[PDB]
Subunit: 460 residues, 4 copies
């Protein structure tokens, strides 16, 4: 005998599965009694979450608006079209010059879909090296020559690097490598680069070697929407992005592509739109995740607001303020500052590896990540998440105090037990000094609001 | 200018922050329960799944595997994901020493393309059930004119096998013939519109004869598999990929199962799938997992192990059967003459109709079917029972669905005979057709008599 | 102190290196005191050999006539142009409709060069299966899936087969496989197919699936020159060939390609010529072997002669006569006859493998090769070489006697020692019956003239 | 109609069977010895090599390896080929337990492309000396515009390294930098117009640092290598490919050498090259061996181990040096300022001339050089000593060659200044130029004073 629809289909989660209910509540507390400094993380809005957990997940809508494989998409179409037009509006794009596909399941899929549209297998790609701040999806093989990223498995990648002493992109060595190697695609954009991008220069290099130019703006998408950093849309043929980082929406990706007539350089037009959409479906993805697309549409509307431009401005200023704080304490920052949402902290001068600081920090509910510079010798630290919780400059200056205390403890433990990791671990067991910091982090964290859910009704 | 307070942008309900989207979701809530959904790939998932899906799990970055993440703060995400992985084994009755699972694929197509990347180099050969015979795009697809459509045919080398051109069953003899000519590294079984069960043992026989891996993509029938109501592919397959949002009734995600442990006989060797598969998902293809999806999936998998889910699985079968026997009783033709799973494939060419015309008119009566190919424009339509069975429909109610479809096809032929075969002509008969209106209205009245999972009809804006 | 030019540069081979001199003399005797039935072998003319061993080997002439990379090619150019025009004349081709490149070093290179001109790596190719009579260069992988032929390593090949009971090409299963698999290139022509080729049908199949059609006529090239078999030039886009088989020239290859306007099927022309020449040089080969090209030009002139049409006619008739002889003794021929230079002898009916007959035959200076049918169950037997020595029908009927005696001895040994190869070997040691046959072969072989050198001045 | 008798078609000499070709060979015999051949890749081989080359060895089919042929009748071909293989090891002083050789390549480019197929999968990465810096097409070559020209760049993934842009030497630091960015599976050393020796130990250092195989293509300097007059690549390279018709003075063929036996230190492992290389030649790429070439090569290899060949090798070096020092003494510029092998590379841009104009005028005086690139139309010409040294020329005679070239370049500038830089203009000065005639005639008079290998001048038709 079948369970009545009420019993299995309508009963709240807290009853259907306490185990998972209880774990979600514990993660809810973790997100708001710690200090979240992972530069790729944010806290999204309750509205976005409601769209995300909606009946839109039940619908199959392979294809795209007006070219669907089967019917019943009368309202999905308005949602997707509404999502696409808000995407253009949030980045101030004329619709006669740009289009967007909002179906990619996430960032990595968007990237691989766009490659598939414009490149044949084994075509050459250049992206920012991982160790110089790049991303897996831009290409990565190891020193042994094992191909790690699918970009490196299905295409041929070669990375360009930052200057070995300044930490800035080396635009001359870039140009040099593009002309030896002759990539069909140059990727700009990164995961841990703390400075803005000279897209005009990348366009100078791409025209010199015959390449397409793609920007992957996942990290700074929110800053781009507020016109708070250089717009890659002025110079690139394609822009990919994530929607859950500085943009503060759901986890999803977007591909923006040029349309209309070519800037004279004959009398032809761009041919990206059909190749891009087709690469997404039917080539690479199945049915779009329409709950994600609804949520994104909500996030794109929020992202166009005056309140969101102030958020973007405040993200940059918080990162600067934390940056100037660390430097005033003697600490080294890659490029000696920041122009975007993150700072890159160089720990080799102190004799420390990124692993050791990130472990002790994690012990105090400060989440950072180890990260390469120029074992990883640094940590990446971002402003968006905590800024979304309403922290301003005085507050990030205090986060800086917390970090400074962590590294001190880290040096004191290294000074007492040794440089090897087996030795560093020995001084984490029942450290009364680490405890005192975890408590001070928790009390500081509880002074702030939290978007997405109500802290006044959570189980813990 | 100042920052918006957290309560204003971040806690305010969706209905205030964005009326337009709230409105459109409410309209689509109405469409889902005032019509008849018969897309074989569609289901209606539980409110408990949707609560996990719309949750704060979407803020966490957890690149990696439980226990081996890239950065910290994953104490509870590792628990949710491990719970999910252990429940995926339970729901399909797998010994934890012979099978593992990766639950990170964003969807079904990502799970397939990751599975291939793990066990194949680029351009390796693949065989899957042809699209025209009931297969799926991710199993390989180029057109007559040579154009490579599926990613699987772009980065690997595919060649399809077909059903018997007169009976509609998989032609197992011709499968073996092609696999020995072509020598694929991977054979795929499973499909999107195949109305019979699969002979996995036979597929294992062919894979062992030509030296291929055997992968079953069980997306469509995964819920029937969990309930042990169809043949299990785990008895014979090396890898089993699946979607979780069809007959499984979960969120939109995918999973990849792999054999692990010792192999029956090249000396005491063991399966090596585990590492290559997890690594193919991350870091090779995917980025951060979608943790809300993994929590929602963990919910669905627990629900999928409950005694009521077995009853649900039996019922979708019986509902598909009853509808099949009802249609044939009215004189219609079904590919292979019936069904043994969740769907029926309806051959319309005997009526001189295209699946196009039937799908269009049905949609105008709130009946969602999709046009579909038959062994030989699409000459059929595909019809599935999971969704409507999830709303409580039993056999008597699917015989009423069959009566509606009959009325629909009768409307279609009366339009064809009146205006012509041309699709220009056909559409003329769909304007102001009071006979269609009475059917759309008879459909909506039937539809309202049954409950609805996921939300509360008593709370909807449009009643 | 340098050796004078006379001492090292002009001294005859018999003095500079007796070892090699002596081995060449022993191979000279072997070629004219045996019975050479390898269908791919011939005996070429003294004139061709003189061109082959000429000062033309010292010249570097990268490029082609009138487009050379450097000078001094005033006479090489006339030789190559003379070679190309004789190539067209020997196969009755209008020069406004066909061109030829005569630079490929041999057959396999010609084939791989032509693939390279018209296909991209991994494009799909269909060729006659090896076991059905095809050639390595048309595509070959093993049952384990190891790629053997470079055609299978750098492109994707799938073989079409002969009918499992008649041994003829299965033109219906051919068409079926081309439409599933969709090759960009279909190869026709073979190494051991004893019947003519329905090129019109192959053209019907290639137009149905969008493929180029190439014929590899290496084995029957001489028969084509005499218009003694169907011309592939009526129906194919490209024809490759060897020049040392039935054509009786030096070891080298040629690529013929269509030129001029397309047969209407708009108003465009063929684009093979530049791609083909470019694939040969600079893509695949270095300097052409100008001694080979001189020799080929000599062979092409000989190949146009009335004496050579009679040779081609006589090759076919000899193979028929040997064919009808074996069959009159009860033996099975694949397709029950032959229309070209070879017969394929099916030995499974007698309970024998091709290995065993070819070993005993080799013991009597009868050279044949084991070969697959439909361990290999057959032997391939060709007429050209012995026909070039002037054997006519009565003489090949006698060769048939020799073969019949060999198989009898082979059955008698199998009947006495066993079916396994370890057992068959046991009865080859000091077999007085095999000796009597080797002697009868030698005395028969000495009754005939020999081209290429003078038997009246050889060391042995 | 009847068959021509064997004596008529098959035994009649070339001069009767085909006057046209006989005539043209005789004219080309005359060109070869009444001019000055300075193509660095050209030589004049011995009559004994040519007798093996034009022999009945061309009738035999011997697909396979000695001992492991496809069909019989190869008793003496296996002996010739084994003799040839053993002499190839002797001529380069290789221990038979550490090195093997395959002598079946039809030419140099086939030997290279077979070597790659044996040790690399398709699309694996390769680094070779750039064309513009002195490398060879088979080492990889795409143009600025992206066009893939070399087969090596079509089926594999190549990237060139370059000479130092001011000194002309290989830039070993930038080589190491690129190889660590690009991670090739194979590094190639050797070239076609590099005037210095190679630092194989350095190349081995880079290959070991980035984990690549190291192959030396020694085509140009193989004769100098056999004579131990330049650095041996066998000390450091895994595989050594070569042509046999340049400084080696053999027929047109190639060879591939491979290391075999134990490797110095991943535990007591051994080299695995032998099988993959022979199999790559046959059956993967080539068909029947050209046995006349293998016999002719066996002759050249014996001759190449004689004491006179060492004296010849020393002399080509000294001849190239003397010509280099003579040219510089007249004010000319040589890339890297001299030579340590068989050739000089002459930078003409300092005179405002293109290699085109010099090569054209030289050809009109029976002086064969080839235009060639320099570190930065080709701005240089390449000039080689092997050929003319083979005719007995020593230093005094190469200083006379230098005097002729000087006269040639002086004629060229006097034409440039008179008519202009335009190649339209330039050609105007080449018609009825009695100063060129006196130089063409002074050249032909010089040329006749020296003997000639391969044939007998006293027997030629055109004297
Ligand atoms: C058999 C099969 N496998 C995989 C997938 C991929 O699912 P995703 O959309 O999650 O990528 C599908 C899609 N099923 C679509 C249909 O039959 O209507 C499928 O039918
Ligand atoms: C620059 C960039 N591009 C794309 C992505 C892909 O995102 P998905 O997880 O949605 O696939 C990332 C991930 N950024 C992860 C981090 O920096 O921690 C990224 O940093
Ligand atoms: C270094 C090098 N390697 C290989 C080859 C190939 O040789 P084949 O032509 O046999 O394929 C050449 C040709 N040398 C031509 C020149 O330098 O003028 C070469 O210079
Ligand atoms: C049909 C065919 N095509 C091409 C070739 C290549 O020839 P080369 O050896 O010149 O590469 C062969 C060799 N025929 C060999 C045999 O049948 O014994 C052949 O049979």
């Amino acid at each position: 005998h079948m369970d009545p629809v009420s019993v299995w289909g309508n009963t709240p989660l807290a009853t259907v599965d306490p185990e998972i209910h209880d774990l979600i509540e514990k993660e809810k507390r973790r997100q708001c009694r710690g200090i979240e400094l992972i530069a790729s993380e944010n806290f999204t809005s309750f509205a976005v979450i409601e769209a995300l957990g909606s009946a839109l997940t039940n619908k199959y809508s392979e294809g795209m608006p007006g070219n669907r494989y089967y019917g019943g998409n009368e309202y999905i179409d308005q949602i997707e079209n509404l999502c696409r037009s808000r995407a253009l509006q949030a980045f101030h794009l004329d619709a006669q010059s740009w289009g967007v596909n909002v179906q990619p399941y996430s960032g990595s899929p968007a990237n691989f879909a766009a490659y598939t549209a414009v490149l044949n297998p084994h075509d050459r790609i250049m992206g920012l090296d991982l160790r110089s701040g790049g991303h897996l999806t831009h290409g990565y093989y190891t020193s042994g020559g094992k191909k790690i990223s699918a970009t490196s498995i299905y295409f041929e990648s070669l990375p360009y690097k930052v200057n070995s002493t300044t930490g800035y992109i080396d635009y001359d060595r870039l140009e040099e490598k593009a002309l030896d190697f002759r990539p069909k695609l140059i990727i700009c954009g990164g995961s841990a680069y703390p400075r803005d991008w000279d897209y005009k220069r990348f366009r100078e290099v791409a025209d010199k070697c015959g390449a397409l130019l793609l920007c992957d703006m996942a990290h700074t998408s929110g800053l781009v929407a507020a016109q708070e950093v250089n717009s890659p849309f002025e110079y690139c043929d394609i822009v990919t992005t994530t929607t859950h980082k500085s943009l503060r929406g759901p986890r999803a990706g977007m591909i923006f592509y040029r349309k209309g007539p070519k800037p004279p350089k004959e009398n032809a037009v761009y041919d990206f739109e059909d190749k891009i959409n087709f690469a997404v479906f039917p080539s690479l993805q199945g049915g779009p995740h329409n709950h994600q697309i609804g949520a994104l549409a909500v996030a794109l509307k929020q992202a166009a607001s005056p309140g969101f431009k102030a958020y973007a401005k405040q993200v940059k200023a918080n990162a600067v303020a934390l940056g100037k704080y660390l430097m005033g304490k003697g600490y080294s920052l890659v490029t000696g500052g920041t122009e975007n949402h993150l700072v890159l902290w160089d720990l080799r001068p102190l004799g420390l590896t990124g692993n050791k600081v990130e472990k002790l920090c994690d012990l105090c509910n400060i989440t950072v990540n180890k990260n390469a510079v120029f074992a990883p010798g640094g940590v990446r630290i971002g402003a968006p998440a905590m800024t979304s919780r309403g922290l301003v400059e005085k507050d990030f200056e205090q986060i800086g105090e917390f970090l400074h205390r962590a590294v001190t403890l880290t040096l004191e433990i290294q000074k007492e037990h040794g440089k090897l990791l087996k030795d560093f671990n020995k001084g984490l067991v029942n450290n009364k000094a680490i405890e005192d910091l975890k408590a001070d982090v928790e009390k500081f964290s509880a002074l702030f609001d939290m978007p997405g859910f109500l802290v006044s009704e959570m189980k813990y």
